[PDB]
Design a protein around this ligand. Structure first.
Ligand SMILES: [Mg+2]
Ligand SMILES: [Mg+2]
Ligand SMILES: [Mg+2]
Ligand SMILES: [Mg+2]
Ligand SMILES: [Mg+2]
Ligand SMILES: [Mg+2]
Ligand SMILES: [Mg+2]
Ligand SMILES: [Mg+2]
Ligand SMILES: [Mg+2]
Ligand SMILES: [Mg+2]
Ligand SMILES: [Mg+2]
Ligand SMILES: [Mg+2]
Ligand SMILES: [Mg+2]
Ligand SMILES: [Mg+2]
Ligand SMILES: [Mg+2]
Ligand SMILES: [Mg+2]
Ligand SMILES: [Mg+2]
Ligand SMILES: [Mg+2]
Ligand SMILES: [Mg+2]
Ligand SMILES: [Mg+2]
Ligand SMILES: [Mg+2]
Ligand SMILES: [Mg+2]
Ligand SMILES: [Mg+2]
Ligand SMILES: [Mg+2]
Ligand SMILES: [Mg+2]
Ligand SMILES: [Mg+2]
Ligand SMILES: [Mg+2]
Ligand SMILES: [Mg+2]
Lengths: 106, 271, 88, 56, 55
RNA sequence: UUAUUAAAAACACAGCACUGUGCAAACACGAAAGUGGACGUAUACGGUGUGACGCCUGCCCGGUGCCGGAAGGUUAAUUG
RNA sequence: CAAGCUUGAGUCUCGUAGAGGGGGGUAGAAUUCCAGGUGUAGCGGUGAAAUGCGUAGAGAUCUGGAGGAAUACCGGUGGCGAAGGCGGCCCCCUGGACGAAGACUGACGCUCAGGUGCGAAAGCGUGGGGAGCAAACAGGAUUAGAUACCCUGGUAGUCCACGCCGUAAACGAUGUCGACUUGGAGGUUGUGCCCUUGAGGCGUGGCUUCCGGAGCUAACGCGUUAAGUCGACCGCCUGGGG
């Protein structure tokens, strides 16, 4: 029942499924009695180096309080999904809700 | 678990057996049994066509599903059983409608596990899906060559197949021999490896253990007369010739594949 | 190692009050809960030699405390090793 | 150390820019160190000696 | 305290070739130089910063 | 194991190795249809050599074989 | 022997830093190989060469793919660990250390023959893997010779899992534990207070580096992290060879 910061970037050719992709993963998280601290759609962003002959991935950030058996199944759906090109789960000490620098860079 | 025997007799000194305690100690499922009588390596002309085959223990045949086409319906594994017809173990599964089938037992699968076939199944060891729905890089077994025909590759104990690439209507597989092969993407595969991976760790220990499996003794061609083998003859131990088969074809190195209609599917031969 | 509420249950259960954390029976029972818990770790991680050295310090500290308790008060010592299942 | 030549910049000032840029970027010394293998006991002995003779 | 997502702060601590500048020169204290290098390495993985120039 | 002058140090053997074989398998018996291999699928199957186990297994690719390569030289039917 | 005490030794509460250990994923740069494109006579190597590679199209250059190993910069007289040792990033399991204010137990302590465990690299066994490097080996040089130093290749090994071995200039060539004995300059990691702007300063713990005083030492040197002044216990030495 720990805090996690999750970043995943999406292939840009399926960027209109992104609000559908977010609200599908939320029902698995709030449905595990885990609370959601932040949820930021960053949009299309120029990559610093090419991945899979690409640039301009679609970045989504969220900060989550959840148990470990929900976050373990979130990377199985990160792995077997062909739309997520890159993801990153990190453990956090305390829940974060202040706006990130990516929201205040707009 | 490999176990060493104690040298209480000279025929027991070198015996190493593989003992699996999770196998079913009991009789097999009788509706899935058939008669299977032995050949002696003789064909319908009555002639020996393969040497060194004969005797051994009586065996009944288990009908194993290599097709895995009961799509959509879940199945729970009842127990693991011994199969005398192959090196791998088999599992008895129970579908929700009440059908029982034998499958090849993959690695790590116990009683109470849930398997499912079909196009919309989950990516976990034991499930069978078409290879256009399997991630590239996966380890699969019981792989089809034609769609609907049934699994033919990676059946022996501990064997598997890696899906190396998917380009178009074909996928490229790295076979267990080291061969790269194209197979069409509508063929099914089962996730995981085949179980019983320490089958190659066993030591028979004595000549009778080979005779229990229906293996007859091999005579060296150099131990014969010239009328019997190309290697025969000599006054003492003479060889003097290039090593050949009993029918005169140079063995020890010469390639024998001559099949022009399947050569387009083979990307790289083994090394 | 041991968590906070699993720790505080043993102090209320095995001590004189909720302030008595330092008595001999509490220290033996706090070591016994972690020693029995770390068996599941070392059944998976046989090659973890650097953690097993810290497990063996709890084993030698419980044995020294048990031999001290037996020399002072044997009647209290018999109650503890039955409740925890030590020495058979 | 990629350096573009700007407008009406002579040649010898962009040569000097390229020379100054890869001297600061540390490219020739990274290549000349990585040309032979050094044992980790020789790396520590050189590292210890360079730290002791940094005594002003 | 240092964050990998703060790209404008992290870019004042890399060279034009992308190498991390040592705190001998930048003057960062030792506790924050370790937090800077770990956070720069997280950002390189998300391709917010580059490892090199050529790529 | 040489029925009927040879029972052995010969044959087999568990173990070891090399080699072929991607399944309409290699291979074998069959003018062929088919069959065995196998209701097996490379942890498998055929051929060859050595012969439990222990310590081991050095140098040579000039000759013959085999695997690979294709610039070039030479080269049949066919055309004329 | 009995009864105590809290100063030694332990337990709990709140935090901090860390390449401490085990397991599973993943990323980028580079080398090698395979396929294709462009292109044409050299490449490679050395003190100079040759062996080798290359007109059957090399080396160079671009695109795509496979695979293994190691993680530039950060990076340090830096940190952790009993020692051996440990360095990309992420997750799971897990050991220790240190600080603050308290509360608790009440000498529960120190050392340790025999015993048990851990223990670099090389090596051995069984099964895998095999890019780079490289004992043995081969060829080319150098040389009086050259079983070498140099060059071109190259197998075991180096890598993984599970067992074995039990040795190193395994070194601080300095056993462990405790108390006492002037100072200076630093590093690292906590914490307290003061005008909490200036923001900076003064203390108080842990670990660590370099000088140096008394004292000690054959000298060199060591010097509050002692090789100074003492106590407890253990290991070990008795001329050089053999
Ligand atoms: Mg045979
Ligand atoms: Mg044999
Ligand atoms: Mg004869
Ligand atoms: Mg003949
Ligand atoms: Mg003969
Ligand atoms: Mg003779
Ligand atoms: Mg002969
Ligand atoms: Mg911890
Ligand atoms: Mg006779
Ligand atoms: Mg007879
Ligand atoms: Mg007779
Ligand atoms: Mg007789
Ligand atoms: Mg006899
Ligand atoms: Mg044979
Ligand atoms: Mg023989
Ligand atoms: Mg030829
Ligand atoms: Mg670590
Ligand atoms: Mg080319
Ligand atoms: Mg090996
Ligand atoms: Mg050399
Ligand atoms: Mg080895
Ligand atoms: Mg010694
Ligand atoms: Mg050492
Ligand atoms: Mg040292
Ligand atoms: Mg010594
Ligand atoms: Mg000094
Ligand atoms: Mg002096
Ligand atoms: Mg003597």
């Amino acid at each position: 029942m720990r805090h996690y910061e999750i970043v995943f970037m999406v292939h840009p050719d399926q960027s209109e499924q992104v609000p559908g992709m977010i609200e599908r993963y939320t029902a698995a998280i709030t449905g595990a009695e885990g609370k959601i601290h932040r949820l930021e759609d960053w949009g299309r962003r120029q990559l610093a180096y090419p991945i899979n002959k690409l640039h301009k991935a679609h970045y989504v950030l969220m900060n989550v309080e959840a148990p470990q058996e929900v976050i373990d199944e979130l990377e199985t759906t990160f792995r077997f999904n062909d739309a997520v090109i890159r993801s990153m789960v990190m453990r956090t000490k305390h829940a974060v809700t202040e706006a990130s620098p990516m929201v205040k860079a707009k | 678990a490999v176990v060493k025997c104690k040298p209480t007799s000279p025929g027991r000194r070198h015996v190493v057996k593989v003992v699996n305690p999770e196998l079913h100690k009991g009789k097999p499922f009788a509706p899935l049994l058939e008669k299977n009588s032995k050949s002696g390596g003789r064909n319908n002309n009555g002639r020996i066509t393969t040497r060194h085959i004969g005797g051994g223990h009586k065996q009944a045949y288990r009908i194993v599903d290599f097709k895995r086409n009961k799509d959509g319906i879940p199945a729970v594994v009842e127990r693991l059983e011994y199969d005398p017809n192959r090196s791998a173990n088999i599992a008895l599964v129970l579908y929700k409608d009440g059908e029982r089938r034998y499958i090849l037992a993959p690695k790590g699968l116990k009683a109470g596990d849930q398997i499912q076939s079909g196009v919309d199944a989950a990516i976990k060891p034991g499930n069978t899906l078409p290879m256009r729905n399997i991630p590239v890089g996966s380890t699969v077994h019981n792989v089809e060559m034609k769609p609907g025909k049934g699994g033919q590759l990676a059946r022996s104990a501990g064997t598997y197949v890696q899906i190396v690439a998917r380009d178009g209507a074909y996928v490229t597989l790295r076979l267990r021999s080291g061969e790269m092969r194209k197979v069409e993407a509508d063929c099914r595969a089962t996730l995981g490896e085949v179980g019983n991976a320490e089958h190659m760790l066993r030591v028979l220990g004595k000549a009778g253990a080979a005779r229990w499996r229906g293996v007859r003794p091999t005579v060296r061609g150099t131990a014969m007369n010239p009328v019997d083998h190309p290697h025969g003859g000599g006054e003492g131990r003479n060889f003097g010739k290039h090593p050949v088969t009993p029918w005169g074809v140079q063995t020890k190195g010469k390639k024998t594949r001559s099949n022009k209609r399947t050569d387009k599917f083979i990307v790289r031969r083994r090394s | 190692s041991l968590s906070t509420e699993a720790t505080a249950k043993i102090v209320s259960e095995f001590g004189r009050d909720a302030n008595d954390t330092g008595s001999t029976e509490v220290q033996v029972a706090l070591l016994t809960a972690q020693i029995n818990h770390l068996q599941g770790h070392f059944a998976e991680h046989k090659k973890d030699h650097h953690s097993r050295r810290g497990l063996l310090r709890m084993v030698s500290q419980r044995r020294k405390l048990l031999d001290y308790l037996k020399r002072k008060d044997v009647a209290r010592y018999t109650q503890l090793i039955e409740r925890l299942g030590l020495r058979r | 150390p990629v350096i573009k030549v700007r407008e009406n910049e002579p040649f010898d000032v962009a040569l000097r820019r390229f020379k100054r840029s890869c001297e600061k970027a540390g490219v020739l010394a990274e290549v000349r160190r990585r040309e032979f293998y050094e044992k980790p006991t020789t790396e520590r002995k050189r590292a210890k000696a360079s730290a002791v003779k940094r005594h002003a | 305290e240092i964050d990998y997502k703060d790209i404008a702060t992290l870019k004042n601590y890399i060279t034009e070739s992308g190498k991390i500048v040592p705190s001998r020169i930048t003057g960062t204290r030792a506790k924050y130089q370790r937090q800077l290098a770990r956070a720069i390495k997280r950002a390189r993985y998300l391709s917010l910063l580059p490892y090199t120039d050529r790529h």
